From a paper:
Despite the biological significance of these two glycosyltransferases involved in pathogenicity and avoidance of the host innate immune response, their structures and the molecular basis of their activity have not been investigated. This study reports the crystal structures of [name] and [name] from [name] as well as multiple structures of [name] in complex with its substrates (for example UDP, N-acetylglucosamine or SDR peptides), products (glycosylated SDR peptides) or phosphate ions. In addition to the dimerization role, the inserted domain was found to serve as a binding platform for the SD repeats before and after glycosylation. Altogether, the extensive snapshots of [name] complexes in multiple states provided a mechanistic insight into how [name] recognizes and glycosylates the clustered serine residues in the SDR proteins.
Two glycosyltransferases (GTases), [name] and [name], are responsible for the glycosylation of [name] SDR proteins such as ClfA and ClfB. [name] first appends N-acetyl­glucosamine (GlcNAc) moieties onto serine residues (O-glycosylation) within the SDR domain using uridine diphos­phate N-acetylglucosamine (UDP-GlcNAc) as a donor substrate. The subsequent addition of GlcNAc to the glycoproteins is catalyzed by the second enzyme, [name], yielding glycosylated SDR proteins in which each SD repeat is decorated with GlcNAc disaccharide moieties. The glycosylation of SDR proteins mediated by [name] and [name] protects SDR proteins from degradation by host proteases, thereby circumventing innate immune attack.
Residue numbers in the entry: 0 to 307, 312 to 317, 321 to 384, 388 to 500
Write the structure that this text describes.
């Protein structure tokens, strides 16, 4: 029996969902339950994006599966340059300021080659031209080395059809496209599998065929990128058990629990709930709201999305670990410091993150004369050891691995009471305080009270240590183990 965690891809910078999938894989591995990540989109770099985090046997990508390239690792290097020069007798001309070569048979321009690296060891693509210098085809190479896909062009370099190959060069898939709103859209997919041909109209139907090929009685699927994975599981039989995993708030308007439309990315899953064995959410609080909303039609279970040097060697250092985005309302932390510096002149606030609001934050900093007090700082382990308190002033939240980590480092926190995440990781007067949303006066008062009472900060710090230890690896392993056991027994 195999547990499959179905996402979309891995990027160069891992998203929240991708991290959650990899963290879950690692727990299942420690546990001794077989698990694999399952990826859906064609991504000829996937093997490189994955290398830092999972091995090749830890994942199955859909395109790899049908291209007979699952579990394949990197080919020994190949010097395309020498082969073109010495064995094909072509003429190479380097393109200034790049990794690209133009390729010629004497006076005739044949190809434009692009390498990933300055050393020309990783061929990326090769464009082909006809006698009129029309670009008729593009060859896309997998980072492992093999030619993965050829794309046939028409008119102004528009995508008409694509052919996907195994490492030996055999065609395994074909995709035909038509343009809508200026972009190519799949209209047909042919797959060569099991010595037959199979036909589909879109990638959702291809995905559903792929799930069906993977499944054996005893296996369990987890739907993690539901915008794509729910329409796929909807086209598969109910004999295949699948758990839906929510990674964010489930409705567009958190303040209308009963009537708000579901998030567009979850609509397909919620509109077909009886397909799913359960739903997993990261917080007890979101669990209660979703159960109510779906009238308990399937089980909802909260399982955190992750688990938890010298400590508290204490200037008064406040910290904020938060994207610089409007929902985070980081300007309020500036306003808090503006008010607190009069009473606390050795105060500092360090804001770790990035985003479109940095400009305005710097302007307010300069406006208030706080340049030696408030820092936009852009691994946070050394940053925690002297942190007095964390601040959260957001108007909406999710379960925060960042907050988990600062709590493991003994750093207490004062947060607005907003859904979801703060109530999960903060117990008032134990490891921090929860403040009525947008009540900046209560925020000031509570922040000042912890600054004026270091013995209170210390108790809160010791409670932060204690709170983090409830999220240990071994407690997560036990939650996951019990959940899978139970889910398979009921199915």
């Amino acid at each position: 029996s195999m547990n499959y965690f179905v996402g979309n891809s891995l990027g160069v910078n891992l998203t929240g969902i991708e991290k959650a999938i990899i963290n879950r894989l690692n727990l299942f591995k420690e546990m001794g339950r077989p698990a694999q990540c399952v990826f859906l989109s064609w991504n000829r770099y996937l093997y490189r994006n994955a290398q830092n985090y999972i091995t090749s046997s830890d994942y199955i990508n859909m395109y790899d599966f049908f291209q007979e390239a699952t579990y394949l690792e990197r080919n020994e290097p190949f010097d395309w340059l020498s082969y073109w020069t010495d064995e094909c007798h072509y003429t190479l001309k380097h393109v200034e300021n790049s990794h690209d070569f133009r390729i010629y048979d004497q006076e005739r321009f044949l190809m434009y080659a692009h390498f990933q690296d300055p050393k020309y060891r990783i061929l990326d693509y090769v464009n082909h031209f006809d006698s009129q210098r029309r670009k008729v085809k593009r060859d896309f190479y997998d980072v492992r080395g093999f030619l993965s896909c050829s794309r046939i062009l028409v008119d102004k370099q528009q995508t008409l059809c694509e052919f996907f190959y195994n490492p030996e060069g055999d065609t395994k898939l074909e995709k035909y496209f038509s343009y809508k709103d200026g972009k190519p859209e799949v209209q047909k997919i042919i797959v060569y599998y099991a010595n037959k041909q199979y036909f589909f109209n879109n990638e959702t139907e291809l995905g559903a065929f792929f799930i069906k090929q993977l499944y054996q009685h005893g296996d369990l699927f987890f739907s993690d990128r539901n915008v794509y994975t729910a329409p796929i599981f909807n086209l598969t039989p109910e004999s295949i058990p699948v758990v839906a995993v929510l990674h964010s708030t489930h409705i567009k308007n958190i303040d209308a629990l009963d009537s708000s439309p579901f998030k567009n990315v979850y609509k397909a899953m919620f509109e077909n709930l009886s397909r799913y064995r359960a739903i997993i959410v990261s917080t007890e609080q979101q669990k209660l709201d979703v159960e109510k909303r779906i009238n308990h039609t399937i089980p909802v279970v909260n399982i955190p999305v992750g688990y938890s040097t010298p400590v508290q060697t204490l200037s008064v250092k406040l910290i904020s670990v938060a994207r610089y985005s409007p929902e985070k309302q980081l300007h309020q932390q500036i306003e808090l410091i503006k008010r607190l510096v009069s009473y606390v002149p050795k105060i500092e606030l360090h804001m770790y993150g990035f985003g479109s609001e940095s400009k305005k934050l710097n302007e307010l900093i300069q406006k208030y004369g706080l340049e030696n007090h408030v820092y936009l700082r852009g691994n946070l382990d050394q940053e925690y050891s002297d942190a007095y308190l964390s601040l959260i002033t957001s108007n909406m939240e999710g379960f925060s691995l960042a907050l988990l980590e600062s709590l493991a480092h003994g750093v207490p926190v004062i947060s607005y009471d907003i859904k979801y995440g703060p109530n999960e990781l903060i117990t008032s007067d134990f490891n921090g305080y929860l403040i009525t949303k947008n009540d900046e006066d209560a925020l000031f008062d509570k922040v000042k009270y912890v600054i004026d009472h270091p013995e209170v900060q210390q108790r809160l710090s010791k409670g932060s240590l204690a709170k983090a230890q409830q999220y240990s690896k071994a407690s997560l392993i036990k939650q996951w183990d019990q959940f899978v056991r139970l889910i398979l027994e009921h199915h």
